[PDB]
Amino acid sequence: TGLLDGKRILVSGIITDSSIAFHIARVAQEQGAQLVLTGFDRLRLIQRITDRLPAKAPLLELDVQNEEHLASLAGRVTEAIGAGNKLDGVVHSIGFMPQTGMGINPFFDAPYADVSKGIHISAYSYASMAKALLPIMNPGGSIVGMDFDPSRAMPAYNWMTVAKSALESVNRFVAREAGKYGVRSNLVAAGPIRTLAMSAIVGGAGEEAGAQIQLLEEGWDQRAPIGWNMKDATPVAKTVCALLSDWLPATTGDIIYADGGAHTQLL
């Protein structure tokens, strides 16, 4: 008697057990969903992480920059879930921006090749995934992507913030296409979560950037009327599952904020 009982859902973006996608996958399985997972590059290592999930799930290779991976995705998912079965949900939890465009490097010093790679992986791929998977989605279906509120500029995030602005626009266009299939498309704008890259910047991977991210995180918990725990991805995973469910059936091309309400408060 789970929120997602009998739903077939594809979850991309698991790299470590701290990944937001790991928590999305875990909560979805606790709620009765049958998953199909996608991983990038380090598949053997990712399989060791996904073995820690409460239930078994097939793991498929997917590099969103690889046109052949995208062209074969629907076929490979259909083989994993059985012929005549379609997906009810798709989770895009993919993002990347090279250090030249996200970190200590000045905003003006990011070369376009790095910015373009970042936008391809972080924004364009939301449309690529929808193009590949909409033909194998059921009506009442739901596509969810991960966002970080880019309405205002902030230190260090730089070109990743620009990529999120592009993602929000892409989501609105994806909703127009998804609507033809009776499928919704939405983003979850999360507050800061201590994943691999976030733990590295706070850890000093130098001093100036580390301090900026610390100040940003402290301010977030301060502004949030219900507080914000950057070490806990569960409220974010629950929000994604709410959008994957049948309980937000008239919401599409939109953004749901799972940020403790921090974006609604100035001070």
Add this chain to the structure above:
Amino acid sequence: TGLLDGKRILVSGIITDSSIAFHIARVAQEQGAQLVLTGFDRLRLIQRITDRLPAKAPLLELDVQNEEHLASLAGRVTEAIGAGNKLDGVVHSIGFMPQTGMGINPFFDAPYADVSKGIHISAYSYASMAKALLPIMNPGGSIVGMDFDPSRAMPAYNWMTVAKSALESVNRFVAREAGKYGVRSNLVAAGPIRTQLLEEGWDQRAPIGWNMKDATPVAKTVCALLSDWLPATTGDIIYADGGAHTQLL
């Protein structure tokens, strides 16, 4: 086994069986919630409507313009749900603007007495209800109000649109207060519901379409916010409008 199993929820705003609050109340009961209902003025007529709901629920009088009704509300709800029990949810589905400020009357011809009454009932009362009920709410609780996107001006809705702009601001302040109790506060901005060119353009803009004769998708959205499935969302607006507000043409 439902979405709101064992939750105690107060639902205001039922006047007819077409009221958005009637559909919110119906879906919440289908999902296992134990309700307390509030009504305005025509209580005998409202009790006949609430008798049509799938389960029994106590009906309490509440005129949001009446300070005595507000002062006694928590006490009356506690008596209805039993001593030692608190609310998990509150639904504000109240709105009114006299014809002088909402309809065919020119925007400039609405007298302030009418605008003030409309704002009192439609916006200020969201704070009044939260003030009265937060002392009797459990942590993890949820306050939901009804909204109509007022970010852009439109024909006829005139001063009611102004009242919705005020409501959205009130909601952000209510969230600051509610947070102290571990309670969330959010609005559901719905598309038009039958409770003409403006309403036709909605279904055309909406990527998943819009059915103005069906309040169920709106009621389901309210129930999602009343549940434990949006635990990090507060002082916010969820749009149950078929996605029309995200599309220009």
Add this chain to the structure above:
Amino acid sequence: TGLLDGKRILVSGIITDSSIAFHIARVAQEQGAQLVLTGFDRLRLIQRITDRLPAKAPLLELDVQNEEHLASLAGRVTEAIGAGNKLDGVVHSIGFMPQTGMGINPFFDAPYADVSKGIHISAYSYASMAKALLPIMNPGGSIVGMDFDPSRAMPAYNWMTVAKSALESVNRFVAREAGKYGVRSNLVAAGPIRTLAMSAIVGGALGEEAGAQIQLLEEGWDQRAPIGWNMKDATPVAKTVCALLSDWLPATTGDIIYADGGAHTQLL
């Protein structure tokens, strides 16, 4: 040649020489505008303040809560500027919220009578002024009101923030009406300025706690603003209002221009 050469502009909201309206009036006169000023209640005291402006201007009584003052306004302005002459600009620089709705008093403790008075003066009156003055405005005309960004909640401002949310909505409806006359309607959302009430809260009038939270708000504003923010200087705000009163933003209406050092565009 001034930015507003030969323009006839009504400016409301002067109470002290620190009032944003005083600085709007001063810059407009420096730029060649012919003004008509409106004041509330203490008119003799306001006349002593307006005598400090670079040029003479008739001062008319206007209580926005007084229906008779609104009904006679157009007639009184016409008498001041001469028959056959119309206004090119209108500046609404009026705001009020009692201490029960704006200050140290809890958000839930503001009674509706106080909130209603505050909304009447701060939001509804923008429509009242437009209704009274649009029949005596020239095409190409401009109505400007003062705003404080209410998109997010903040400490102390409380019901004044709610009144500003209502004002922004009113402005969008006023633009629909003004458009029929070839007149624009816009708001200038300013950063914090040390006017009468602002000087009082910073000074400790509302206590230690309120003084500290307004100080923190002001420091954060100058920090966030990429070009900084000087709360002691109303001139950048006055210049922005004059830009909207000019012919240089001719396709902007029902809108908000931010004169806040760019603070609202930055998170940290």
Add this chain to the structure above:
Amino acid sequence: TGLLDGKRILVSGIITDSSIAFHIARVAQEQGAQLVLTGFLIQRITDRLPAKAPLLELDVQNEEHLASLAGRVTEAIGAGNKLDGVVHSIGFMPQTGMGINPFFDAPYADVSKGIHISAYSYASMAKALLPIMNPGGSIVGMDFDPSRAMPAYNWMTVAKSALESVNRFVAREAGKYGVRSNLVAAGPIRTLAMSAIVGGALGEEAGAQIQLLEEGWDQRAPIGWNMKDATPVAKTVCALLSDWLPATTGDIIYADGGAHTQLL
């Protein structure tokens, strides 16, 4: 006694006399500004402007053009002189990403070229020119409101969403020099590509789509909207280049007849 008397302003984006940049350049010269123009033929068009102005080559995708830009501008305005204004009126999206081609059928090479020219180049131009800008300076870019999706504009709308974000970051950098950075979000203007789509170049369906958008725009705008007249847009850019909006940065000013503030 013009709005921009004695100001030295760089204007990019002139291709035809219908280009928004042509009208920005014309109004700025009428208002006393001394211009430096950049083009990507164009000299024959710029000869139609009221005053003479040096024309410099600038392909924003060309790293050598960007690296030498400040030096070439300094040579044109004289040593010891700096710019007071910069106008970015550059945009491009191949037909695969903007037009009749389905949103999902745009290849990344085309989208990436479009984003490079339309969004990233706003940061490139600021990087190259901020070292040669005076305090009180102003950088202005052209935008088309991308807050909501719309037919045909597709990936160009995505590029504009990216541009709005870029502008907010450019403002942080510009602030260090006492320089403002803002965008003007204009309503539809009948420039080269816009005249082609309305004319039927992309077919019957696309032509009808853009005609409906234009009609709706004029209808919603409380003061109306004339798509054949770029002058209100050029005036707005000049207002931002002036000293009259000195506390506005990382922002968007809408020169759209107020259409974006009205639903119907």
